[PDB]
């Protein structure tokens, strides 16, 4: 809907200005207005992660994954949150899935980021 789209733009503006709590609020509205749109979940996760609200961020990334399995960013985001909460083994699994999807849908464009997350997860484990 147009109002979901306004909420996504508002979100993006708040996020851009590092106003995390207002981004959370905007993405919650995006999610209410377009509950099947994976971007709202991933986007709210991004803001919750900046707030160090990791269980919530991870739950939203999981929901984004359910709504759009080709949404590579959700996988990368989730792994990053899993590293933050020392779920290393899980992160490495999530990164394996992200690398595969990244090749399939993005033709490798996020490979560098995924490989450095993988390295970081492996070493801390």
């Amino acid at each position: 809907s147009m109002k979901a789209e306004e909420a996504r733009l508002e979100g993006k503006e708040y996020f851009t200005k590092s106003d995390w709590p207002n981004a959370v609020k905007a993405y919650t509205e995006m999610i209410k207005r377009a509950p099947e749109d994976a971007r709202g979940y991933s986007n709210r996760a991004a803001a919750l992660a900046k707030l160090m609200s990791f269980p919530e961020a991870i739950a939203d990334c999981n929901k984004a994954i359910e709504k759009d399995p080709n949404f590579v960013r959700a996988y990368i985001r989730k792994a990053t949150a899993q590293i933050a909460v020392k779920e290393y083994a899980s992160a490495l699994e999530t990164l394996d899935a992200a690398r595969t999807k990244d090749a399939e849908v993005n033709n490798g464009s996020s490979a560098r980021e995924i490989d450095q997350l993988y390295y970081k997860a492996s070493q801390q484990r």
Partner: peptide, 7 residues
């Protein structure tokens, strides 16, 4: 990187 990006 992803933690700096929104859609």
């Amino acid at each position: 990187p992803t933690v700096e990006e929104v859609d």
